[PDB]
Amino acid sequence: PKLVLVRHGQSEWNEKNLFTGWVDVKLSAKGQQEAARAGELLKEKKVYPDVLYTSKLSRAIQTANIALEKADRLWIPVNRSWRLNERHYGDLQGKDKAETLKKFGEEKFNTYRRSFDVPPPPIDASSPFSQKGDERYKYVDPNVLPETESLALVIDRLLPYWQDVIAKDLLSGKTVMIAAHGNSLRGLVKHLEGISDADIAKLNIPTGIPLVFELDENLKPSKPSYYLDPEAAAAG
Amino acid sequence: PKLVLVRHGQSEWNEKNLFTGWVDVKLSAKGQQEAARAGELLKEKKVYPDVLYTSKLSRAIQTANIALEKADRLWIPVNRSWRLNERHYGDLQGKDKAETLKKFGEEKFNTYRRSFDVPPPPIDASSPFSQKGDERYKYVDPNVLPETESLALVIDRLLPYWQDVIAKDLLSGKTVMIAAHGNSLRGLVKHLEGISDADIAKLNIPTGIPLVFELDENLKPSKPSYYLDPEAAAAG
Amino acid sequence: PKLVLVRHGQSEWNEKNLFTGWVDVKLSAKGQQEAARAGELLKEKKVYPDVLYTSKLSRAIQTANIALEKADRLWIPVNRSWRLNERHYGDLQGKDKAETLKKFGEEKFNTYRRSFDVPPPPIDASSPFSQKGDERYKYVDPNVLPETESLALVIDRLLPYWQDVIAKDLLSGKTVMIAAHGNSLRGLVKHLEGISDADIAKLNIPTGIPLVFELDENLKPSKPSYYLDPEAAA
Amino acid sequence: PKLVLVRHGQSEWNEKNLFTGWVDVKLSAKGQQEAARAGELLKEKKVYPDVLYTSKLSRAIQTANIALEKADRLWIPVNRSWRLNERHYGDLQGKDKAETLKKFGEEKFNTYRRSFDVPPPPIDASSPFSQKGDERYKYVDPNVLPETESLALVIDRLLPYWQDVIAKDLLSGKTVMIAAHGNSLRGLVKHLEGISDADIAKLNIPTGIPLVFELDENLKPSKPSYYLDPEAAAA
């Protein structure tokens, strides 16, 4: 089995230092260029996904699209899941990152930001930045949909989708591409490689460079993962 | 939303005093009759399933196969999932019950059976009662398949199927019928009714009597769940 | 690719000499026994379907079920289609076959019965034996659903399902089983083997004996088709 | 039931005077703009697709990919099918239009283009413009894939997809948007509106302007189909 991970480029909210989470912000101008770059790289390195999986967030879907266009594999079957979404950013959604750094303190900031299991505070249902009741989730059990998340919770909800849905395709011989987010992709990597809960806070997946994993029959790295641009990704 | 649960009747293993779990034991002539009764109740009380969900275990499949024939709704779409399978009994699978009750004194016997948090001994891959590597689960991530299960674990691997899949048909106005097993059905009832970890071990759903649940937009019981033959069930 | 065809046993209406068509009549007692026999044979001859396709008619679905139970492959994924249904029997639906033989004459009878392209008359929408508006077809384009059919028309509607849906599985490596009817199966065979339109009237698929076809990459017989009980088939 | 059709704009082949058919030619910078306009109309007029259907041809895919981004409905489920592909132009695929107009006199040229019942010359498997054996169609019965197509044939292989698949979402209250091609869209309009074999050759749907169809329970137009920019379509 062959799997390809792609982290979308920057979000418009990202360019203005705002916490996005499940807010459906779109890609930035350079975000869009990285998508082309990612697709460009996909073609260059001869990696052809047979299927596409994306979250329900437009910034990821755009990336997948601009990338497949450039890769010449737009015809590919596509499935989307709330499960591959970014980490819900609780009450922190839509708030300035420099400003949240001074509201709380570095300690509590890195907790609400990088605590493996401490999610930001729950966002109020009436806040303009909560998507509780959003059209794209009307068919999902209302109760599973979070109002805040941590990488811990994210992994919980991501794994089933990988176990049943994504895995069936991998096990069928198809090459899959997953256009997703930072925390959602980070969670799959932690799981995919066997990284401790204390170490996961140090791994960051760069945006715009396809990360490939050649998996064995048990869906585990048969060889080490690789970026299609080891040089750019190496930078950090 | 309307959900109808149906627990299969007796298998030829329960009939012979054997723990079953995930072994694909056939339904006994007595079970087959209870299913026809389940289908009869469905028809008599006007419970018209629009979609059918079952496990990967034949006794649950056969039950629906017979229940639906008598309900005259055998055309209904069928969907199956390991996630709806009976709790995996581990090492206890190919084991005479009366013998393990003696082998292990109450302390071990009663716990393995009704403990919510602690599972039975894992069954080895060598055992002729292990499912490790079974065909019907070759398209599922090998690392997720359990070798033993507590109700806790069952509720855990079942919830995401309920949340994404069954929830969609339910939220689409499709009356869904589910054919599963004791632990899986109780595990779902507990979530719907919010039964506590300490109280769930008390609950039991009669074999062969359809259970209807009227649900609201948030999939919560809008009124108490009822059996189609309240009288036959009440004798529990 | 490996494909398995199974014609359900007799219908309750069949035992009483009535034209069934799309009427949702169920299996007869012996019909049910042949299903077991078919599944029995499936196991015996080591043919294991990975997927199941059935029409929307209960007499076919039952057969598939009783058969898979006996074969020990109930866990199999299942899909159903109005396209694999029996030939709609027009105004002839629910009518006595001996009696229809005397209403019309042998000539017109064998026309309304075996004419490759002359369907029985259209059945009136109000007749107790029309399923126009039936629950199992509410999601299908109202206009495609027939009110009479001939093997000709049947093949038209059956082919797309075979082309897109059944073919994808065959092309994916799966072994497929199709629990269907006389005309629907006859149509797939005519197509599968390249039998003329004038010759198709002579081929009849026996009920209760799995017919297997070992297909090549182009979905055509790589070897000749075979029943899992060549003897009874003969 | 509500259906919204959207014909893709110009490809880099139309731009260079080449017949396209089933060749997977890219959408030109001009087509890309018409799609953003299609998405804008969708948003402006409040046409909210719930599901998206497209062909296996990138220009149709890209159109939806852009139209939906501007409509802010990029999360909508996507379904694709060869059955929604443009008519297969046969031997005329990798051919300069002005040249075939000269090569063949009106008798042949105009017919291949607008005849309803008679198709173009079959393209050979050797041609670098044949799709025989293409990856995106490896899961479809090899015997069904056309080497040439008349509108008649297109309407024929398209109808069953419409009847079983699109019909289900339509009958489930899902507003469905379809991104296809001139012949496929006209072929569907003719069925919906019952246009005759002789009249269909007259119809044409403007590239880039969404077309809405209000349908009844039997999927018949409950009122005339309208363009989201009636004025631009009227030109």
Side-chain angles (χ1 to χ4, degrees), chain C residues 139, chain D residues 51 53 79 165-176:
Chain C
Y139 288 116
Chain D
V51 181
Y53 280 99
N79 309 101
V165 192
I166 310 173
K168 184 164 197 153
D169 286 324
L170 238 14
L171 293 162
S172 296
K174 258 75 164 183
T175 296
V176 353

Side-chain angles (χ1 to χ4, degrees), chain B residues 168-189:
Chain B
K168 183 164 198 153
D169 283 324
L170 239 14
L171 291 163
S172 295
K174 259 74 164 185
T175 297
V176 354
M177 168 179 142
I178 303 186
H181 319 273
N183 298 316
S184 305
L185 291 162
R186 286 191 302 113
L188 192 55
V189 162

Side-chain angles (χ1 to χ4, degrees), chain A residues 71-217:
Chain A
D72 293 330
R73 319 211 101 230
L74 249 3
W75 54 269
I76 242 56
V78 170
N79 299 102
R80 318 194 146 122
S81 184
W82 75 268
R83 292 183 186 262
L84 289 168
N85 267 14
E86 176 64 278
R87 140 163 125 219
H88 198 292
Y89 240 125
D91 183 44
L92 272 46
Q93 290 191 169
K95 291 168 173 162
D96 198 291
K97 305 175 182 156
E99 302 184 354
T100 272
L101 176 45
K102 50 194 71 170
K103 180 174 196 164
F104 309 115
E106 288 266 70
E107 45 133 271
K108 203 197 194 192
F109 180 87
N110 224 30
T111 282
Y112 285 0
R113 245 202 48 123
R114 279 307 189 251
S115 179
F116 177 75
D117 33 43
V118 189
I123 189 174
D124 170 29
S126 68
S127 174
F129 308 106
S130 178
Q131 34 294 121
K132 174 271 165 178
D134 201 296
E135 199 189 339
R136 68 195 83 197
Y137 310 112
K138 65 196 297 194
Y139 288 116
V140 180
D141 177 18
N143 306 281
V144 67
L145 271 6
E147 292 200 293
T148 322
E149 291 189 308
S150 48
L151 226 210
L153 296 184
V154 167
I155 295 174
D156 296 346
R157 35 141 276 211
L158 181 162
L159 292 187
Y161 195 69
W162 162 266
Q163 285 156 358
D164 286 19
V165 204
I166 300 159
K168 185 184 173 181
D169 270 317
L170 251 25
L171 288 171
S172 290
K174 274 67 154 300
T175 290
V176 332
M177 181 178 135
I178 304 190
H181 313 287
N183 293 268
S184 55
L185 286 178
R186 283 211 303 140
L188 179 58
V189 186
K190 151 95 177 293
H191 172 235
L192 265 173
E193 293 183 339
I195 295 170
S196 73
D197 305 66
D199 276 340
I200 207 52
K202 278 48 196 283
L203 168 98
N204 213 298
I205 297 188
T207 83
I209 308 132
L211 208 213
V212 186
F213 288 79
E214 287 180 40
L215 308 161
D216 55 28
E217 53 163 292

